[PDB]
Amino acid sequence: NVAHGLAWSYYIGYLRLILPELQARIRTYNQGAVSQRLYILLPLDCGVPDNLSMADPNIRFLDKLPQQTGDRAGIKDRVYSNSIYELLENGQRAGTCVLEYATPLQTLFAMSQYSQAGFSREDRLEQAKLFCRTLEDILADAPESQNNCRLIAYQESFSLSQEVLRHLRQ
Amino acid sequence: NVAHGLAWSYYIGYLRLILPELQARIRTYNQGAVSQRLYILLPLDCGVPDNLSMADPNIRFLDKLPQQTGDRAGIKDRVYSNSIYELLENGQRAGTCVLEYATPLQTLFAMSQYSQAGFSREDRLEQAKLFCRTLEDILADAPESQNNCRLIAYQESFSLSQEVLRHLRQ
Ligand SMILES: [NH3+]c1ncnc2c1ncn2[C@@H]1O[C@@H]2CO[P@@](=O)(S)O[C@H]3[C@@H](F)[C@H](n4cnc5c([NH3+])ncnc54)O[C@@H]3CO[P@@](=O)(S)O[C@H]2[C@H]1F
Numbered sequence A, B: 001n002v003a004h005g006l007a008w009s010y011y012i013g014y015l016r017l018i019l020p021e022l023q024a025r026i027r028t029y030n031q032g033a034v035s036q037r038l039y040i041l042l043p044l045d046c047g048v049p050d051n052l053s054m055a056d057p058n059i060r061f062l063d064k065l066p067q068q069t070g071d072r073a074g075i076k077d078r079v080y081s082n083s084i085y086e087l088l089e090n091g092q093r094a095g096t097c098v099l100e101y102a103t104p105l106q107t108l109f110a111m112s113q114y115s116q117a118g119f120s121r122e123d124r125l126e127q128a129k130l131f132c133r134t135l136e137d138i139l140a141d142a143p144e145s146q147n148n149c150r151l152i153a154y155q156e157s158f159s160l161s162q163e164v165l166r167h168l169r170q
Helices: A002-018 A022-030 A103-112 A124-140 A160-168 B002-018 B022-030 B103-112 B124-140 B160-168
Strands: A038-043 A059-064 A068-072 A075-080 A083-088 A093-101 A149-154 B038-043 B059-064 B068-072 B075-080 B083-088 B093-101 B149-154
Touching (some): A002 A103, A002 B002, A002 B103, A075 B059, A093 A160, A124 A149, B002 B068, B093 B103
Parallel strands (some): A038 A149
Antiparallel strands (some): A059 A083, A068 A075, B083 B093
8 A cells, every 4th residue: 555655666766776876885985894785774663763873772873975966856966865873782893884764664654643644553564564575575676786785674672783783694 | 546655755754844944044045036935846747857957948057055954764964955946038037946846756657667566657647646636735734834835737839937937926
């Protein structure tokens, strides 16, 4: 239903555009090294806090990648930026990677709360699971995703940093 | 159907966020003046060229507004930028305004071409008309839209610059 559209919008408007020019931006920042893949958190509870340092203290913002720009729909130099986070484990730099949330989930949440949107608060977990399934099916035959993307879906004590680290070691 | 989701995504992810901080960015650039409203082109043929200077030569890029940033879904300083265009009429500066296309239309087009998206090329005109209707209904009770937004839907000789100018003089 609704999630299907957002997942294609999330691919045609973002992933399809920044994933090709992604390793260049990492190989540029590198010159502890950063990992070559964009890690997309996919909480099925649709809990997307803007500050990534609140879901887990062991997730530390480090720096930004070099910006990417592109004229898009009449906006000269529309710019895509991505935050580099390092993940701690017992006070130890255990990883470093470009980590971010899948914004469309935050939209599904913020969309349900509105009355005029006709979107129930109970469907939030199904649309999330439909957003991940539709997204992973897209990336499954995505030439833009030439092994440079890692989807991290999860539900909920819990350690998000351990969840990202687990996918890092692979 | 699909367009309904994109229109709420287009409001919760963009309009709801930049429209409040919009007049400040204009009143800042001003200090020929720029108009206080964001003008959103809504072509029902879903023809959204990235370079706005191609649909009409009398639409001239002028400058960018001051950027807006906000931590969004774990991206430190995600930045929203908006291009200032001036519109010519018989080689005469006839207007100046922050003019842009509604990117989700460009998505509906680029979404139809994919086979895995299950979106026909014939539904493109209905989903466009559903995107405008759903969007204008949102802005109709949008406190964020305190008379600072102007929707410009149109179909197709034709002069886009005349179409924007017509809404400017009101
Ligand atoms: N500056 C700028 N200019 C014009 N339009 C903008 C815009 N900022 C938001 N919008 C409008 O909002 C729609 C939905 O926005 P939202 O955020 S809820 O979801 C996005 C997001 F998930 C992802 N995305 C793209 N850039 C990203 C960056 N920097 N960081 C993280 N995510 C990114 O792509 C989805 C769809 O993007 P669209 O462009 S197809 O439609 C977008 C677009 F119409």
